[PDB]
Amino acid sequence: SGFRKMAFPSGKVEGCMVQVTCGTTTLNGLWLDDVVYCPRHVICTSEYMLNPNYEDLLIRKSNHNFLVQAGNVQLRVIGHSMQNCVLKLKVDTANPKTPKYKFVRIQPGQTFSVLACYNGSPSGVYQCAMRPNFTIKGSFLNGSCGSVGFNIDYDCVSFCYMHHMELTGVHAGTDLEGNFYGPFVDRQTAQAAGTDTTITVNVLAWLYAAVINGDRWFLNRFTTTLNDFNLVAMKYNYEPLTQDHVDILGPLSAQTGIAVLDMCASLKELLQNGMNGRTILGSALLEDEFTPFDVVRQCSGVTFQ
Amino acid sequence: SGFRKMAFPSGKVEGCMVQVTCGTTTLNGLWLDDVVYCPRHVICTSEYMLNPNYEDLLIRKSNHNFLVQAGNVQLRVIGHSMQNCVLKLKVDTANPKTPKYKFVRIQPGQTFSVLACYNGSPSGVYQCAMRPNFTIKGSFLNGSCGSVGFNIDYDCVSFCYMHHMELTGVHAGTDLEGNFYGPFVDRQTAQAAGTDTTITVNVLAWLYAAVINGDRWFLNRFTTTLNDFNLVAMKYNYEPLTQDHVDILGPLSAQTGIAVLDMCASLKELLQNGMNGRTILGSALLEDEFTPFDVVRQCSGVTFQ
Numbered sequence: 275s276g277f278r279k280m281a282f283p284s285g286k287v288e289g290c291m292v293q294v295t296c297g298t299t300t301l302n303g304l305w306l307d308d309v310v311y312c313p314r315h316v317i318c319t320s321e322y323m324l325n326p327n328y329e330d331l332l333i334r335k336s337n338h339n340f341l342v343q344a345g346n347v348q349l350r351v352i353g354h355s356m357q358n359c360v361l362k363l364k365v366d367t368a369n370p371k372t373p374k375y376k377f378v379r380i381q382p383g384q385t386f387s388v389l390a391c392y393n394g395s396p397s398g399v400y401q402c403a404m405r406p407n408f409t410i411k412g413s414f415l416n417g418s419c420g421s422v423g424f425n426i427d428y429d430c431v432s433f434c435y436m437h438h439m440e441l442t443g444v445h446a447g448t449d450l451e452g453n454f455y456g457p458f459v460d461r462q463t464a465q466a467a468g469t470d471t472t473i474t475v476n477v478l479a480w481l482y483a484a485v486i487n488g489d490r491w492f493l494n495r496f497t498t499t500l501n502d503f504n505l506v507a508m509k510y511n512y513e514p515l516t517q518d519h520v521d522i523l524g525p526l527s528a529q530t531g532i533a534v535l536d537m538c539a540s541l542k543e544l545l546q547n548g549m550n551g552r553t554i555l556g557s558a559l560l561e562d563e564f565t566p567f568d569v570v571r572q573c574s575g576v577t578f579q
Numbered sequence: 580s581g582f583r584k585m586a587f588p589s590g591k592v593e594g595c596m597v598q599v600t601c602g603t604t605t606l607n608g609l610w611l612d613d614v615v616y617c618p619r620h621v622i623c624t625s626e627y628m629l630n631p632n633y634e635d636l637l638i639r640k641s642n643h644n645f646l647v648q649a650g651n652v653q654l655r656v657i658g659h660s661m662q663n664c665v666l667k668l669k670v671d672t673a674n675p676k677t678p679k680y681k682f683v684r685i686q687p688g689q690t691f692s693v694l695a696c697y698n699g700s701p702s703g704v705y706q707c708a709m710r711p712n713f714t715i716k717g718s719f720l721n722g723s724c725g726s727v728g729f730n731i732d733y734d735c736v737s738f739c740y741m742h743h744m745e746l747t748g749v750h751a752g753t754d755l756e757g758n759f760y761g762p763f764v765d766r767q768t769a770q771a772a773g774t775d776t777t778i779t780v781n782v783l784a785w786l787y788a789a790v791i792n793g794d795r796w797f798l799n800r801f802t803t804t805l806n807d808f809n810l811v812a813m814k815y816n817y818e819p820l821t822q823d824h825v826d827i828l829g830p831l832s833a834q835t836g837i838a839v840l841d842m843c844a845s846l847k848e849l850l851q852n853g854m855n856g857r858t859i860l861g862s863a864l865l866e867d868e869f870t871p872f873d874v875v876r877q878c879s880g881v882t883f884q
């Protein structure tokens with residue numbers, strides 16, 4: 275028992291991380307087979323951070339302006355191209371530690387692990403959710419650009435995020451095809467993150483984890499309907515709940531014998547009176563960065579190889 | 580910026596994890612050079628979980644009763660011995676992925692990463708603190724015995740914890756020399772964890788992290804003394820504060836320009852009036868599982884290779 279914010283084991287990703295330097299800018303890249311992926315803003319200078327024209331900047335480069343280092347070894351860049359907001363650097367050596375991988379774009383509410391890196395060197399791993407406003411609440415210092423987010427499916431690494439910038443305390447990036455999450459661009463403009471909301475299906479999954487781990491004080495005998503629940507959620511900036519969400523919570527309902535709409539009635543109450551100084555799984559706030567699948571994984575115990 | 584519960588990258592440990600079976604019991608082992616380390620209770624059955632005599636149980640075994648599997652490969656056990664509460668299984672093949680390592684015993688208040696494993700397969704990584712009562716608040720299901728806790732110092736893995744049991748919701752284990760943290764034994768008795776307290780120097784480190792990240796609302800103009808502070812801490816089950824702790828917080832005081840005893844005055848106030856519905860770094864409780872070093876690492880950015 276117990277319940278922690280748990281990240282995927284990162285070994286498979288650590289072996290893909292490299293350092294990419296162009297000019298006086300150094301950041302991280304992802305080396306899979308014979309391609310290094312990194313944020314295209316590595317080709318920027320100071321003059322072009324406000325209004326860059328990346329096609330122009332790229333045409334003025336040649337392969338030898340790109341220093342790519344895998345630990346000690348240097349990788350020879352033999353070609354380059356741009357795909358949306360990433361740069362693909364073709365190198366002379368295929369990474370022998372290339373895992374089985376795929377590139378997937380995630381949806382708001384889903385969680386992933388981030389391997390934070392500096393100078394191509396892994397520093398820390400943590401779990402976060404993609405927020406409804408398409409940012410993540412990460413932990414990133416200067417030089418972390420190119421750090422990746424990922425999930426593991428059995429033996430397969432699904433890369434879903436590459437870090438590009440910080441915007442007023444939160445973080446924005448792209449999928450691995452270079453397309454931004456959210457309405458952001460990789461230049462200096464007046465862009466800000468929109469209003470965030472709380473991910474309701476994740477809060478319910480976490481309340482089930484609490485029950486599984488013996489925290490029951492917030493339960494009550496009432497039931498509610500999707501529509502009466504969603505009527506109260508909207509007042510509190512909670513995402514509305516769909517029948518799809520009810521179905522996804524099925525396994526957890528089964529294992530605890532508490533119907534989803536039963537548990538919604540407890541959530542309704544918590545929204546209207548607060549916690550009154552009580553805690554749930556060691557938190558005094560309602561936690562929304564665990565998906566139903568995260569809970570099952572952690573409260574039933576699936577592994578990966 | 581941002582602040583997360585961040586674990587060490589686990590690649591270096593993942594390559595040491597193996598599966599150990601004896602009889603109908605399967606759990607995890609740590610394979611370093613040509614020795615596999617695992618909890619000695621793998622030699623127990625049902626009859627001997629209450630009052631085992633491990634020396635007797637071990638003499639009745641031979642090397643071939645130990646099935647050790649590293650993924651697919653089987654490792655031939657060529658010798659065994661017991662060291663306190665661990666078993667050391669000598670195997671015919673030295674692990675080629677043995678990192679530079681050492682065995683260290685940690686103190687209450689210090690943090691480490693846990694690589695939770697099942698059947699020798701890594702499942703998740705998370706950060707936790709050794710509590711003042713010598714337990715950890717982990718997340719572990721049946722079969723996680725032998726999972727290890729570790730820190731990384733540059734290129735060197737310091738193993739500090741091997742998981743042995745769950746005791747009423749929390750977790751207890753040994754160092755890698757087989758000596759228990761805390762007054763626990765690896766048998767079924769009436770043992771329970773003693774009273775826990777809050778790790779004050781860690782709370783102060785976290786308040787500094789908050790300031791570094793722009794949360795300043797709890798600061799005030801007052802100062803206090805070690806003795807007046809510790810007088811209030813004791814009422815709230817906070818560990819007393821020493822001059823050693825003040826010195827360790829030095830770097831953080833320097834970087835924020837807030838003296839330690841200054842920050843203690845803010846903590847005093849928070850203890851006496853609570854948060855009044857406000858949050859600090861996204862928490863509504865005072866967090867004590869980040870050490871001063873964790874904060875510096877995360878709010879300044881040291882890496883490892």
Ligand SMILES: *C(=N)[C@H](C[C@@H]1CCCNC1=O)NC(=O)[C@H](CC1CC1)NC(=O)c1cc2cccc(Cl)c2[nH]1
Pocket residue numbers: 301315323414415416417418419420438439440441442443445459460461462580
């Ligand atoms: C990538 N290496 C770097 C990481 C940033 C730096 C700030 C703290 N954390 C991070 O995630 N980001 C970077 O170079 C981008 C590049 C953009 C495309 C032009 N810029 C920023 O994220 C950035 C710069 C500044 C300056 C002042 C205030 C803020 Cl919020 C900034 N964000």
Ligand SMILES: *C(=N)[C@H](C[C@@H]1CCCNC1=O)NC(=O)[C@H](CC1CC1)NC(=O)c1cc2cccc(Cl)c2[nH]1
Pocket residue numbers: 275606620628719720721722723724725743744745746747748750764765766767
């Ligand atoms: C090791 N594989 C296993 C892991 C435990 C199982 C319970 C949930 N989480 C864990 O960490 N633990 C194990 O075999 C030990 C062995 C001891 C030395 C004899 N036992 C327990 O941790 C255990 C068994 C039970 C039964 C009922 C209640 C509790 Cl708290 C128990 N703890």
Ligand code: NA
Pocket residue numbers: 493494495496497536537539540
């Ligand atoms: Na109810």
Ligand code: NA
Pocket residue numbers: 798799800801802841842844845
């Ligand atoms: Na003060």
